[PDB]
Structures are given as C-alpha cells and as structure tokens.
Scaffold this active site. Structure first.
Site, short mmCIF file in Angstrom:
data_model
loop_
_atom_site.label_atom_id
_atom_site.label_comp_id
_atom_site.label_asym_id
_atom_site.label_seq_id
_atom_site.Cartn_x
_atom_site.Cartn_y
_atom_site.Cartn_z
N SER A 46 0.84 -1.20 0.00
CA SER A 46 0.00 0.00 0.00
C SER A 46 0.87 1.24 0.00
O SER A 46 1.97 1.22 0.55
CB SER A 46 -0.90 0.07 1.25
N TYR B 176 -1.64 -1.03 10.46
CA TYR B 176 -1.69 -1.35 9.04
C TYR B 176 -0.46 -0.85 8.29
O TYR B 176 0.16 -1.62 7.53
CB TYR B 176 -2.97 -0.77 8.45
N1 NAD Z 1 -8.68 -0.49 -1.39
C1 NAD Z 1 -7.68 0.37 -1.13
O1 NAD Z 1 -7.85 1.59 -1.08
C2 NAD Z 1 -6.30 -0.19 -0.86
C3 NAD Z 1 -5.26 0.74 -0.78
C4 NAD Z 1 -3.95 0.30 -0.69
C5 NAD Z 1 -3.70 -1.05 -0.62
N2 NAD Z 1 -4.71 -1.94 -0.66
C6 NAD Z 1 -4.43 -3.41 -0.57
O2 NAD Z 1 -5.25 -4.08 -1.49
C7 NAD Z 1 -5.24 -5.48 -1.12
C8 NAD Z 1 -6.58 -6.08 -1.41
O3 NAD Z 1 -7.62 -5.44 -0.62
P1 NAD Z 1 -8.84 -4.75 -1.35
O4 NAD Z 1 -8.73 -3.29 -1.17
O5 NAD Z 1 -9.04 -5.33 -2.69
O6 NAD Z 1 -10.08 -5.19 -0.42
P2 NAD Z 1 -10.95 -6.52 -0.35
O7 NAD Z 1 -11.64 -6.46 0.96
O8 NAD Z 1 -11.71 -6.71 -1.57
O9 NAD Z 1 -9.88 -7.68 -0.27
C9 NAD Z 1 -9.26 -8.04 0.95
C10 NAD Z 1 -9.44 -9.53 1.09
O10 NAD Z 1 -8.65 -9.98 2.20
C11 NAD Z 1 -9.09 -11.28 2.49
N3 NAD Z 1 -8.77 -11.57 3.88
C12 NAD Z 1 -8.74 -10.67 4.91
N4 NAD Z 1 -8.46 -11.21 6.08
C13 NAD Z 1 -8.30 -12.56 5.79
C14 NAD Z 1 -8.02 -13.66 6.60
N5 NAD Z 1 -7.82 -13.58 7.92
N6 NAD Z 1 -7.94 -14.88 6.01
C15 NAD Z 1 -8.16 -14.96 4.69
N7 NAD Z 1 -8.43 -13.98 3.82
C16 NAD Z 1 -8.49 -12.80 4.44
C17 NAD Z 1 -10.60 -11.31 2.21
O11 NAD Z 1 -10.89 -12.44 1.40
C18 NAD Z 1 -10.85 -9.99 1.45
O12 NAD Z 1 -11.58 -10.17 0.25
C19 NAD Z 1 -4.80 -5.54 0.36
O13 NAD Z 1 -3.53 -6.16 0.55
C20 NAD Z 1 -4.73 -4.07 0.77
O14 NAD Z 1 -3.75 -3.86 1.77
C21 NAD Z 1 -5.99 -1.54 -0.79
#
Ligand code: NAD
Ligand code: NAD
Ligand code: NAD
Ligand code: NAD
Ligand code: MG
Ligand code: MG
Ligand code: MG
Ligand code: MG
Ligand code: NA
Ligand code: NA
Lengths: 291, 291, 291, 292
Positions: free
Chosen positions: C183, C196
C-alpha cells in the site's frame, strides 16, 4: 520542556506579496531565526564557514548558530537583500566572530569561483560549506514555464552548487563538512513546483554521490530537508499568495516551521563528533514524515 | 516457464571500448532488443509514438514492442548512430507500421521543437512520448569534471526532456501517456556518476510533479527505472572498461539485463487499460530492489 | 482515446458501512473488477495460480485477468465471502479455465499450509502466488488499539504471508512469480492506520529480501502498491464512514481507482517476458506519485 | 579541532569471535567504543527522564551515556544475561551525577513491557524520553530454514515489544517529550539473509511516521534513527555470519564499521527541546552508504 505546537505563530497570516527574493524584515510576522533563543555551547570553535543565502531564512539561522558555537562565518546573498545581510553580519560580530559579506549571483560561474576564493582568503581557511541559496517560483502549468524560468531555477540550484562545491573542495581539510539544503519537495513534487522539485531531488543524489567520493578523504557531505518554513522565499512567489496566508495550516502542528527550529540540524551535521553521518538526508518537516 | 537467470548472457564479457554514443552492432555480444522474441498482441493499436534514443538499447526495445503492438513509431538518435537506427526503421516497417527517423541533438532547444513537430506531422498526431535519450560518462572525481562535462549531462537529460515535453503537450489528447526513463542511480548515486545521478533523481521529481499537473487533464506521466542493462551507453564510457567486462556480476542474477526484458514495462504503462498508473516509478533492476 | 479521469465514478458516495470483511456486492456503487472490460491476450497460457483475497477487490480483478490470459486460478477468501467468491469462480470458468475455491483464515498457520497444498494438488502444480489478502481497521489513537487489534493486523498481513510463501516455495519451479500487495500507506503512514502501515512497509522489505534469496534460483518476487481503490476493505472499517463518502476526492483524478484498473500490473509482473523485474514495488495510485 | 573520521576507529580485519546472542560487548575484539572517554556533555537535556531499551551495550549504551552527561536521568532495559555490561552503564550514569535505573527483562512479554514502563516512571518521577532500541537480529540464508519460532522472536521483539512499551509510555509523556525508535538501513537494503529483521525495521519506520502524526498535535515528537553497520554484539552473536563479522564494513566508503560513540549525537539532537520541528523523521548515520 516546551510544547512545540504553540511555540511559534500559526495561520492565518496577512496578505503579503513581495518581489523575489524578498526581505525577512517585511514579512508579517517577521521570522524567528534564533536571534534571541539560540545559545551556543562551544560545538564549532574556530571553524571557518561559508553559507550561501545566509542573509535570511534557514541560511541565516544556520549562520547565527554557527557563530554562537564559535565559528567564523562568510555569507553569500543577492545585492538586493543587503539590509537583511547587514543584520546577520552584525549578529555574527556580536558573537565575537569574524563576519564576511559576499554579495553576488551564484548563477554566474566566475562569481562562484570568486566567492569561494575570497571567503577562504578572509577566513584563513574553509571547513564548513553550506549550499543553501535557492530560487523557487511556483507555476501551475508547464505551459507557463519559459526556458528562462526553468534555466534560472536549475542554474541557481544545481549549477551554482556544482561550481561552488568544486571550487571549495581543494580548501577543505580532512574533518570538514559540506551541507546542502534540499526540500521535502524532492519527493512531494507538487504540481506547481515542477522545476524546483526537479532540482531538490537532484541535490540529494549529488549529495549522496559526492559523499562516496569524498568520504574516503575524510570530508563528510550531507543534506537537510525542510518541510514548510516561514521565509521570504515563500512570500515572494515560492507559493501563491493565498497559500502563504494559510501556510501549513493542514500540517500536524497546524503551523509552518520557523528557521530557528532547523539550525540545530546544521550544527549537528558539521560537528566533529558526528563522524559517521555521511551521505545523509536529515528531515525537519513537522510530522509530514518524508526524510 | 523459463528460468530468467540463464536466459541471457553473463559476464565476463570481452574488453570492448567505443567512443560515445556507441553502436549496438559493435558490442560483444550484440544486445538483444527483442528482435526475435517479442510478439505483439494488439495492445497499442493505432497509437502514435515518439521515442528518443530509439536507435539502440532500451529505447530500441521499446520502439520494436510499440510497433508490434500496433503503434506507429518515430525515433530520435544522433547522426553517427544511423546504422543502428536503420535497423529499427526496418523492424517497425516489417511489423506493418509507419516509421519516422529523426536524428538530431536534443541539447539544442530548437531541434527539440523540430523533433516533436516533425514526429506529429508525419504520424498525424502524437499520443505516446518516451523521453529515453541520455548522456552518461563516468568520472571518479569532481576535480576532473569540467563545466562542459556537467553541462552536457544536464542539458541532455534534464533540459532536453523539458523542451521536448513542453513542445509535445499541445499535441497530446486526453488518454495519452508520457514515459521518462530514469535510473536506479537516482538513489544508488555511485561516486563515479555525480552529474548523471543528479539528473536521474531530477527526472523522477519532474515526472511526479508533471503527473499532478496533467493527470487531471487525462494525460498520464510515469517513469521507468532500469538497473544495469547491456547497452552502448555503458561500453562507450558510462562505466570504465573493467566494470563493463564484469558488468552486473555482483547482482542477484549475476548478469545485466538485456533491453528486450524491459520493453514490457513501457507497453504496460502506455496501455489505455493501465488507467490509474500516474506519477509512478516502475523499476526493473533484477533484484537490487530499488524502485 | 478515452480520458481516464471520467472512466469511473467520483464521490460523493452514499453513506455505507459493513461489518468486515464486507461484500463487494453490497457497496454503492458496486465496484468494477473488469467483469466486462478486461480483455485477455494469451499472456499466461497454462499457468497455475493462487490468489489470496481473490473473492473481491484487487485480488478479484487479478483473478479474472489471470483466467482471461489463460491461467488456472485458485482463490482464497474468508468463508463468509462465499457469495462474492462464487461470482469469481463463474468468471474463471467462463474464460475456459479451471477454478478452485479455498476459503479459510490465513491467521491460522495450519490453514495456510492446507491452502497451499490443496491449491497445488487441485491445479496439478503452482507457479504464480499472489499474497493479497489483508486486514485494515482504522483507529485514531494508539490508546484505543488493543493487543488483539494489533495482533489481528500483523498476523493477517505479515505472518499469513510468511506461512503461505514458505509453504509455496517447494512447489514453485524456476520461472515462477510471487506478487505481494502492499500500500502507499507503507510510506504515507496516516495517523489512523498505525498497525496497518507498519505491516505494509514490512511487506515491501520482505519482498526485497526474498527477491534476493529466490532471484538466483529463478523465482521472481515483486510487490504492487495501490493508492485508494473502491473495495469492501474501505467501507468495512478500513477508513471511517465520512472518509468513504468522499474517498479520494482530493486526488488528482478526484476519484478512487476501480479494481479493474490495477489488474494489468499483476499480469505484467507474472508474465515470463518481464524477466528482469525482481524485488520491485510497482505503484498505481492515480498521481499521488509514491511508488 | 578537525579530525579525519576515516581512521578515527579500528578497521577490519577483526579476529574470529562468535558469541551466543545477545552477546557481551566486553567479549568483542576489540571492545566497542560507546563514548566512555570521549563524550562530553553540554547541558542539552537537563532534568530529562529517559528510558532506553537495550541500554547495556551498543548504540543504546552510547545513547545512555550521552543522555546522562547531558543532564538526564536514565533507566535502561536489557536481558539478565547481560548484567555485566549493564552494571558498567549504571556506573557511568551515576558518575555523571544522575539517577540510574536497571530494569532487566524480556520485552517479548506484554506484561513485562507494561511493568517496565511503570517501574521506570516511578523510579525517575516521570518520563519524557523513550528510546525503543532493543532488537533481535539473526541472519539466515533461506526462508526454508526460517521457522515460525525464529520469525516470531524477531517480530515479537522488534514490533510487538515496541508497540507495548510505547502504548504504556504515552500517558506519562508530557508535551515536549520525545520518542526515538532505532531502525536500520536494512529497512530498504533488505539483504537476502535478514528476511524477518528487514521486515521489522521497515515496519518500525512506518510506525514512527504514523505515530508522529498522532502525537505531534499533542506536543510529543516521534522520530527514528537509521544506523548503518556498527561494531556491537548484535552482529558478532549472529546478526551477521562469522566471516562477515571478520570483515565488517570493509567495502564501505571509510572501510570500517561505525563505533556506537559516533551515533549518540543523533539521539541527543532529536530529543533536545530546540529541535522542535523534527517529527516523523528518519535520520541516518551509515558512513556514506547514503540511505537515510
Ligand atoms: N482499497 C484500497 O484503497 C487499498 C489501498 C492500498 C492497498 N490496498 C491493498 O489491497 C489489497 C486487497 O484489498 P482490497 O482493497 O481489494 O479489499 P478486499 O476487501 O476486496 O480484499 C481483501 C481480502 O482480504 C481477504 N482476507 C482478509 N483477512 C483474511 C483472513 N484472515 N484470512 C483470509 N483472507 C483474508 C478477504 O478475502 C478480502 O476479500 C490488500 O492487501 C490491501 O492492503 C488496498
Ligand atoms: N521555506 C520553506 O518552506 C522551504 C521548504 C523546503 C526547503 N526550503 C529550502 O530552504 C533553503 C533556504 O531558503 P529559505 O526558505 O530559508 O528562504 P530565504 O529566501 O530566506 O533564502 C533563500 C536565499 O537564496 C539566496 N539566493 C537566491 N537566488 C540567489 C542567487 N541567484 N544568487 C545568490 N543567492 C541567491 C538569497 O540570498 C536568499 O536569502 C532553500 O535551499 C530552499 O530550497 C525551504
Ligand atoms: N544501460 C544501463 O545500464 C542503464 C541503467 C539505468 C538507466 N539507463 C537509462 O536507459 C536509457 C537508455 O539508455 P541505454 O542504456 O538503452 O543506452 P543507449 O546508448 O542504447 O541509448 C541512449 C541513447 O541516447 C541518445 N542520445 C544521447 N545523447 C543524445 C543527444 N544529445 N541527442 C539525442 N539523442 C541522444 C542516443 O541516440 C542513444 O542511443 C537512458 O535514459 C539511461 O539513463 C540505462
Ligand atoms: N550494529 C549494527 O550494525 C546495526 C545496524 C543497523 C541497525 N542497528 C540497530 O541498532 C539497535 C541497537 O542494537 P546494537 O547494534 O547496538 O546491538 P546490541 O546487541 O548492543 O543492542 C541490542 C540490545 O537489544 C536488547 N534485547 C534484545 N532482545 C531483547 C529482548 N527480548 N528483551 C529485551 N531486550 C532485548 C539487548 O539488551 C541488547 O543489548 C537495534 O535496534 C538494531 O536494529 C544496528
Ligand atoms: Mg534573503
Ligand atoms: Mg545509440
Ligand atoms: Mg472480500
Ligand atoms: Mg547487550
Ligand atoms: Na533521513
Ligand atoms: Na516503484
């Protein structure tokens, strides 16, 4: 113990455009460069220093601190800033040290050479160089940026540093320090500081490479990365007038830095005891958390 | 699946020196720019591209890939590189696309304007600009660096980029891409690359600031940061001859990159589907792990 | 050409809160993961992939893209996300490829091991691993952060990655790829994301170190650094509700990314031709200009 | 006056000298210089009240000495097996006329972290400089050899310990206080043989920056120091392999590792009340690697 948040003024500030490079004496409020607060402790006794842009701002705070730590100080500045420079000369001399005033434009290669030669001749040596002079003029679009604007920023902030540093190195004995002022803009890289940010990132690479060249010879080369500070660079077009009025309101302290606050970084980097700091970029940005 | 370690040549290479800018055809081995391996798949169909330094090296690999992805391609280069450039022109046309050959020295502001104008005239527009040409000449000491040497590096790598970019923006529609080639040297900042590393850090800040200006207008601006690659920039004095013999031997793979390997970064950044990549620096350094 | 600014929705968005991990189908608007728009081009034919958090958000966009590029895809997710996950299974199969659904909690070390073993068993091998699952729960002060809260974030985002990666490496042949989602918070390090941000900076260092271990063995390890994207991580507590309402309003585009837009980074890093990209961090942040 | 830093301190090669972790500075060859003879205070931290974890040896010992000579009372944490190193630091603090507090215990234990802070604050009559400096560092060439126990020990020491101590300390810290976290150039150098360690050191920088944004508005500054290679027992007890220790930092611009004495000035400068716009920073001292 003092709470740093409310130690200094916060915005809003009065509307106050100046033509660049501006005068500290005409800002509202006038900046605090440490004139009353900085007390020396013999940390740089007998050192011989040149500070470019030492008339005002961060350079002035560094000049005052150096003098009070026991160092003789030459300052560079542009002739239009003479009234600010005379105050710094008086502050250096009141600390019992030798002051040298060396006005001129560091975009001019032969002036850069004369500046270093006359500073070293006057001081009987040279062993702290601070490259702190800068041009900063915000523009919202590259369409408005002429070659003349771009060239003035690059010639001041990169070529001037190159020429002064090159001329200085034969004077610098083992144990000496070079310190270059850069900016959080090196990586924050605001839309309205296209040429400035380019040079401030360049200064950091120049610092790191030269530290690898000179470290083996006993000369340390470092950089200081301020965040937002209350200096004439800002109110003479470094930021637009409305940004100046509300300068750093959104920062963690909700205020800009005052130049006094960053002088301790320059003293620490130059001190002989800080002997394994080389090629570093030390930030002081109030919690932006960049360098 | 292919093991990348063993996919391309490893040092030691034969002793080989050229005068800059050098010819790829005189290297041993000749670089692999993807002439046989790169297969397009319609990712840039109908795009209109200008690649400076497209005669050899990374820019040649980008030009070949762009043409095979369906784009028309103009390349800049210096006149002494005509024999390399003609090969790239033939590869572009063999892919069925239009090639434009535009030799000239980008240290000349007026040629920079002519280059952009002629590329846009010939192609019927312009919507991918790749600022990739560079000067790199290693020197161990600032004492041996003349103003001429420093200026040649800064004028090629910073002023040329500024002039070409400024002249190109009026041609660029919403949805266009600008890509600037930088270097891991921006932060590795080797002792022997003082001026070069300065410019490459500058290029990153320039990219980031311009991305904030142009993003809101729908134009994306990004940078690519190669680690060590086998190109004529290195054997014509970018590194000293014994480093060229042993180039990248100490890296995690134990070999330098071949230009073929980095072409995919340029295609991906320019592709319309990569619509939230703006202001980025994408590295390809073999595991040095810098950008 | 299409202007990327207006391609996707801009705030304000309706006030909306879900219990974590949330469902994509309950967001207003529903996110675009490329269900209609992503076009495969035969870039990963026959590859064997495991994507954690492949049910929703960025991981879902990557899983759709991998399948359309010709790869078989196993997805991990938490059991309560079955309704999101089954949509992804259907899309993978509609692309003509094999889908595997492997729900479970990666804070459980024994599950991490079963996940990898069952993925490789069902697919007949494994050669792309994407550690993308994450926990993100905003809190304004460390005074409110229980050990349970801190441990949940660190166990999901650091230990889970470690356990899964360690279990996977004996299956991965030379030519394989590991991709870790980090991130911009790794260095933006907002006040309200203390635990985080710690983990996301950790993931980058883990990526670089492992790239130096595995690179020489023919396995590339890279990271992707998104800026703000419209996913259920955010409306289920990753940001407070008023931030979700105005998410990324202040960015250069004035909108957050849609997951569809970042899938091309995962495809490019996985492809065999991108053979000198190792230990990298590739950003897609819309012009914040961080990685 | 002016001294050439290059040959101020010993250069490699050094003798083979493996210790079991955490190691003792007294058993290194040569013994490190923590500033015992050279550091002169100048009244820069008069009346301050400090807790330094891992203050028995190495960088933390050099900070402790300097803090005491600058006028601050000093509590140190360390592990019981290091008592002989810690007793020297206690004597150096007291010889400067300050109060010393010795608080041995393992910061992987949450309950001990809480009691460490409570006992430090009680003994000193308050707390206004916290230095999170203790660390575990054990090199391993491959993840296949890295057990959960190994990974967990590094993460629990370097991230969880810091979290628990910092959380317990903040209610004691008045406006004007400082938190300083020791990180490493490994945060971004990220060597192949320091997979778990580099993870934690990058994590420490993000923790510093985020907490600076939390606490800065309340008048507490949170900063980090990023050493390059220094001559300390962390390295000769397995932080690096034995052949690297023998030749430590031979290829650096000075050709020598740092001695802990050299980095103490960074801790004093960060904590001083005059350095009032330094918050969320990472200040490096790596001898020319040029990282932070
Ligand atoms: N959305 C944003 O603004 C943002 C910004 C920067 C980085 N990210 C990164 O994007 C990546 C994906 O997240 P996203 O934003 O697509 O959201 P999202 O909620 O769609 O995906 C996150 C996923 O994490 C999985 N997960 C969480 N805890 C878990 C556990 N204990 N066991 C198994 N699976 C688990 C879930 O299946 C969930 O779908 C992450 O690594 C996050 O740090 C997101
Ligand atoms: N004030 C801020 O918010 C801020 C933020 C980041 C970095 N900085 C850096 O601070 C440094 C010092 O500037 P400041 O903010 O103290 O403002 P300032 O106006 O007080 O100092 C800038 C100085 O540059 C000198 N200068 C400019 N052009 C010159 C030329 N052609 N020849 C000779 N001297 C010349 C002037 O004498 C002037 O005093 C600069 O390097 C700037 O990049 C400032
Ligand atoms: N090869 C490496 O190890 C390496 C490493 C990091 C970054 N880079 C970057 O890669 C880019 C491409 O270089 P390359 O390695 O492919 O080498 P290359 O020599 O094949 O390409 C550089 C090109 O620059 C052009 N050029 C130079 N000066 C010029 C001028 N005055 N006017 C017009 N054109 C001019 C030439 O046409 C030349 O072909 C450069 O931006 C360089 O900084 C290279
Ligand atoms: N020496 C180097 O080359 C180097 C390089 C970069 C960073 N650092 C950092 O410097 C800091 C200080 O270490 P050092 O190099 O001075 O070595 P050191 O061995 O003298 O100090 C480390 C201290 O950590 C303490 N410690 C370890 N595990 C502990 C536990 N479970 N509970 C309580 N205390 C514990 C011990 O008291 C030990 O003295 C560390 O944070 C390390 O990451 C060191
Ligand atoms: Mg002035
Ligand atoms: Mg060429
Ligand atoms: Mg989900
Ligand atoms: Mg010890
Ligand atoms: Na720094
Ligand atoms: Na990057």
């Amino acid at each position: 113990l003092t709470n740093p948040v409310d130690l200094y003024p916060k915005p809003p500030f009065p509307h106050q455009v100046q033509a660049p490079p501006g005068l500290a004496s005409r800002m509202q409020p006038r900046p605090d460069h440490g004139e009353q607060s900085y007390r020396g402790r013999g940390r740089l006794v007998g050192r011989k220093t040149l500070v470019t842009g030492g008339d005002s701002g961060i350079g002035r705070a560094a000049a005052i601190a150096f003098a009070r730590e026991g160092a003789d100080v030459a300052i560079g500045y542009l002739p239009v800033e003479e009234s600010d420079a005379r105050e710094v000369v008086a502050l250096i001399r009141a600390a019992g040290r030798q002051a040298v005033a060396l006005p001129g434009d560091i975009r001019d290669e032969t002036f850069c050479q004369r500046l270093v030669a006359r500073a070293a001749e006057a001081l009987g040596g040279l062993d702290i160089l601070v490259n702190n002079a800068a041009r900063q003029q915000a523009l919202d679009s590259i369409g408005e940026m002429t070659t003349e604007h771009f060239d003035a920023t690059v010639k001041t902030n990169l070529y001037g540093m190159f020429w002064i540093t090159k001329a200085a190195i034969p004077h610098l004995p083992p144990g000496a320090s070079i310190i270059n002022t850069t900016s959080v803009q090196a990586v924050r890289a605001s839309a309205n500081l296209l040429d400035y940010a380019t040079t401030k990132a360049g200064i950091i690479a120049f610092t790191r490479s030269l530290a690898k060249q000179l470290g083996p010879r006993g000369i340390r080369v470092n950089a200081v990365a301020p965040g937002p500070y209350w200096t004439p660079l800002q109110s003479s077009g470094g930021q637009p007038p409305e940004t100046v009025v509300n300068y750093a309101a959104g920062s963690p302290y909700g205020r800009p830095g005052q130049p006094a606050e960053i002088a301790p970084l320059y003293v620490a980097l130059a001190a002989s005891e800080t002997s394994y700091a080389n090629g570093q970029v030390w930030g002081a940005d109030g919690g932006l958390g960049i360098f």
